[PDB]
Design a protein around this ligand. Sequence first.
Ligand SMILES: *NC1(P(=O)(O)O)Cc2ccccc2C1
Ligand SMILES: *NC1(P(=O)(O)O)Cc2ccccc2C1
Ligand SMILES: *NC1(P(=O)(O)O)Cc2ccccc2C1
Lengths: 514, 513, 513
Amino acid sequence: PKPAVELDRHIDLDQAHAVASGGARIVLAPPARDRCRASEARLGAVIREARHVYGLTTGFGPLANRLISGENVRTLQANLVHFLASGVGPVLDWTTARAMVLARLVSIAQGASGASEGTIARLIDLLNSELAPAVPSRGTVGDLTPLAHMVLCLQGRGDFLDRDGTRLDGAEGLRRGRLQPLDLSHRDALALVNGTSAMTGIALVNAHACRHLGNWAVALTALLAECLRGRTEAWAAALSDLRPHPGQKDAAARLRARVDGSARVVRHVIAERRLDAGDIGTEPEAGQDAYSLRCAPQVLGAGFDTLAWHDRVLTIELNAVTDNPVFPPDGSVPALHGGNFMGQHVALTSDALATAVTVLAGLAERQIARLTDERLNRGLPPFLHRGPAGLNSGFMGAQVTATALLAEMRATGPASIHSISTNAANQDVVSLGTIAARLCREKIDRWAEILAILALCLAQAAELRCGSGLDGVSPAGKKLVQALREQFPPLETDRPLGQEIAALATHLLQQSPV
Amino acid sequence: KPAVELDRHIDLDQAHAVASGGARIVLAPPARDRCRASEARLGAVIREARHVYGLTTGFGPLANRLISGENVRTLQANLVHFLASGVGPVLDWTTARAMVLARLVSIAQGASGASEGTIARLIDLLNSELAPAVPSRGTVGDLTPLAHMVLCLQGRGDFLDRDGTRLDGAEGLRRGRLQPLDLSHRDALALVNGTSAMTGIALVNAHACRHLGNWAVALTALLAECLRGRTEAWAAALSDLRPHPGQKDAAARLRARVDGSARVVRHVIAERRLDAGDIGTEPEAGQDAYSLRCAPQVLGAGFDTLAWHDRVLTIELNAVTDNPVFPPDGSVPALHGGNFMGQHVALTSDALATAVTVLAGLAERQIARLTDERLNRGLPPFLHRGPAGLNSGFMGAQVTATALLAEMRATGPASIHSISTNAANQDVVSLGTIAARLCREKIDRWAEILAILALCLAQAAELRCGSGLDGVSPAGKKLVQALREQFPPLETDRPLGQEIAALATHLLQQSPV
Amino acid sequence: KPAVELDRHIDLDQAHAVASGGARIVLAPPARDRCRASEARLGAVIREARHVYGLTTGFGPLANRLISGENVRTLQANLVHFLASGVGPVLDWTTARAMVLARLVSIAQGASGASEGTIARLIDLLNSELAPAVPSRGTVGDLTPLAHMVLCLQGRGDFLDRDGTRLDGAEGLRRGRLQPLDLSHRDALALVNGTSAMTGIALVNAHACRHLGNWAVALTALLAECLRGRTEAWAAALSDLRPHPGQKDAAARLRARVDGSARVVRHVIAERRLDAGDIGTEPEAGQDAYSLRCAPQVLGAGFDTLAWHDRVLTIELNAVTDNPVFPPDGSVPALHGGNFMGQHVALTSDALATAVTVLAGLAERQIARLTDERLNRGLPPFLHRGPAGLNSGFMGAQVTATALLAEMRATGPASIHSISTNAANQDVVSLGTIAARLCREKIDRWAEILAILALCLAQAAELRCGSGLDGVSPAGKKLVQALREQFPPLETDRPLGQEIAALATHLLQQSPV
Ligand SMILES: *NC1(P(=O)(O)O)Cc2ccccc2C1
Ligand SMILES: *NC1(P(=O)(O)O)Cc2ccccc2C1
Ligand SMILES: *NC1(P(=O)(O)O)Cc2ccccc2C1
């Protein structure tokens, strides 16, 4: 059948991505259902008492000084969704749009938003269906715009996306997925729109992709060592112990595991060798590898530690109440007005992860550059070609493509530093977290393409170095090359690799080498 | 003068205390023992003629050229020489000393083989009032700056006195009562193959950010007192709903700053029940603009970034960043790897620099709001005194704050610019030193923006509450009174450049307590 | 010394000659007269009580506050005061003087109403050996730096001698035999409301780039003599097929540099007819790598950017950047607009900065190639002398070059960071001063990278052709001989940091002719 995620209070990143990718269905736990019914009742009382509350008895933003009569709240909230729907640009992908819906659902499930059962049910139904709302990616300063578009979609007034990205009109979407049109009550409108759900959704998909790409970065660094007689002593646990960064220790341990059983790497600690007068002279190779192999634990480790920080922060943000105003479950006050919708946390962690991704992509790019250079690849053909040299150039075109992809990645910097006072100075500081998360996603996509090129290069390199039988290659390495060859043939003669690179990249983002 | 006893671990505060000369440093007996044991180990490795980088080989891509024992002295002397190609302004006194301290801590772990004499030279330097004069540019992340540090310690390089005044090598050794560095075995490589420069710069950045963070909070609090800010946005209940540690802490500290204040608005708006007669347009909205209302969230994100930066730096400061390294357990004679790769400090420095720029942005917008007569709720335009028009108050200073911020924004992360070098041997580099230095420049600009905000607020508080600061919180009163001891009110237009610079220097070293 | 007579137009070389103290400046009779005429118009505007900014109104958004003529002196006295909120390192001697010159040229157009006395103070400064000490940061693009300039000229600010050593105001006036600035009517606003600081910085950048460009060409040519470079890639025929002026110029200068060389390859390969016996693998490819073959194109694109930069700068330098302005024809009493908006210098400075980073990158790769034993065609690894391994030669310097380039890349354009300020009155700003200063920083880094390449090439030339430079072109020999006058060959490893810095300073000021 299909796994089920029961949402109560906390959901971890793997559970969240499982639901967003449709791998698992979602159910609201009884305790959560009750907490929300209780909040629903609080919203009702707040409204009946005509309390001064943003979005219920006031205008929006700087127009909040304009009080609104209870008789016009329906209209007020209907216009809210309308004026906010000014987004433009390509729609968020299927998994990401759903991740956004999930993020808003989790914030609501904490029982402090006042959302009605129907509204909550509409979000759950969407997540359990095979559809995703079609929402424009640009327009917010960090996530009213994208969420307002989500609301319109859920009302059948906006397009839906199937798993392939094909769009369905509103009516067709509600029909096909057996979704009931969203019926907004009280502040459901503001509740569904005033949070950091878009950026959080984008970031959770980024987190999941990075985990897989990191596994490939490790698996490919290990295979590279098997193709260039790399020295395993640089990956010794003793070294990690002396510089105890969790990410480094992990990276080194994972690298060692990958080459376990290999007869292609060099396992001798050089210091064990005692020299005598006759040894003094120039040797063919230095006693240590170049940095793209020797410093892999330190570089990959720094990236893993950045991702770990990103995920710790994202875990808190995913399970937090990012809404304004909020209705305290204890009933201490009718409501609280603040800025829990300010996505500065995801903005800063997305920018940090973006930098780390660019650094790791640079490592793979240099690994490709070394492997394909006949002057540096220790005996392998230039650009790993097969057939007559000159007539055949092998991966020479692909090597340049890898460099081009990295160069483009570097052209874009952090999004967070560009805050600009807007909304008539009411929003004098903004996070741009959604932009930050999206820019990070783009870099992750380029990294997958660079790793894809490296993977194809290594499959060819392994066969050139060890024969089609991959003699001496570690079990893990053999399995990885064999799996690649199931879909990607050896480069016996020059051929267009563009489509294959793109195809492989798509795979890398969703599955790890095991 | 307090003393920091170095055994295995030292925290960031103890580190800065030694680097800033606030405390002496002593090597604990256990550390001396571990180091002597490592020295004995290196001696054995050399006697056994083990194939070890720097002891029996050339450097970098030239490591394939094996060297005979009789030539190792020359080898290591030349190492210091060819690596001394740095250029640029020297690191400041505190930072250069922090760099020396960082190398000492790495050595004290007992896996470098440094001689007692070399260790003592590092300790002596830190207990003196001097710092080596080392150029700030040249490394890809820290051979260059460390090589210069060695030359200085041999009396072949300049020193810096606390004031930054330079002394020649001979004068430095004499005045600081330092013995010339006498390198043995691989001391040269040990003193040079680590991340000590970027670590030293980063720990100074860490300390400065803690103080500036306290100022950011104290000034946001005073801003609320000058603009009738609403404290409900800083309630603890909101923090609990979105439990980011930095956010909870910022909110709590903000509340503490305005405790006892009669100038802030404490009413929860939702308590008010509306009547039909109330429907219409009211004078002010029920919530504040973001520069006040979202301070917990913005400041908090910055605080969580600094917390991450500090966790990573603490590990780096206390790690052995050297190559090769000699295992204390004696499992193998030596290990060759890449613990000198400063990718961790590079990434955290880049992330912290972004956070600093974001927080400087908040303070810049706070100045912009406070000085705008259309937004400061009744305060004079640009907080001037005397006749308007004839006097413009802080109008110039406000533009200066915007200029400082715009400059910070022009510089991005250093880490993304790795370039293959050293004949492709160093095909990937961290650029951590550059990253930390760029972060330091942003921190300096942030202090200047905060200084401008502080001077504006002292004037605003008096304009709003009178010279007696009636209704101002005890913390707010204490802060203003403290500033006024050295910075007079602006009763008439005057040059503020020098005052802004003087205050910024203070903000970087002390918090409002 | 030589004298530049200012009438209406002054070119960039004439401007830098005055700024650098190489030439004196004199106001031509026609300029004196059109200025006296403007001074008369200012007096008339004031006598008639015309509604004019700075004469009868407040500043910025306070301009809506009309002022009585009985308080205009106070108004302008306070203007200089509140604007003096600058911070940061002072502009260097030559740049600060270039700034004074740019303001003088703007005034010479006769549309500012500046008095003869004020004009005389600016001319006296330029004819002295001094420069005002002005903070580099504070403006959004140049009220702040200019206000500090005024204070310096009134003797209420520091002065700088050619060495950068500071003198107090009183001493500056005394030593320079200057009279204290005595402001009248709107001299204050006239001396402060323009783009003079960024223009001054940019003109110094233009001059420096011309020299570095010449060194970039001279070193690329010498590189070809050290690596058996092919001159057919620099043929005029190729330039004609892709007629970019800069490319045609770069190729022509490159051909001129290697004229007479017996070390470069001059055979067009296509002339060779192949036969069955030739099919096979040859030692080297028939074309060079891009750092040699594509030099005309890379250097040429940089030269075309500089050309654009200088065209725009020439117009800016000779334009009137002030507000308000008093039309020389008398069509109206005064005009109010925004000719102080330095968007032109901002954009060209940013474009030039990018070009400089690109060319510095070329020089960095040329060093990488020259020092790599796998790519330098037989030269020693890192061009060392003595035993290999024991000696590492330029290995440290090569990494330093990479570090310098990486740092240049971390900083981007300044223009894209406009932020609304001055109570939204200045809702868009150019940041031209920041753009020009960032460009200057990159130019300094480029000079250091070129200095490293020059020292590497001097060594490589001798290693390849012997101490007598046999076969080296006359130009190449002259260049190496000139370098060796002050920089000895690297017979053994030594610290190069000081030499790199010294040479960089020279490269920025003189070309290899
Ligand atoms: N983010 C809000 P706030 O909760 O009032 O700060 C500002 C805004 C502007 C338009 C529509 C909704 C909101 C919510
Ligand atoms: N970082 C080193 P490694 O320890 O050999 O990797 C590379 C290098 C280059 C010149 C001088 C010293 C070193 C140490
Ligand atoms: N640039 C000016 P404008 O000529 O009024 O546009 C704005 C400003 C602000 C403070 C002091 C002088 C000026 C001139």
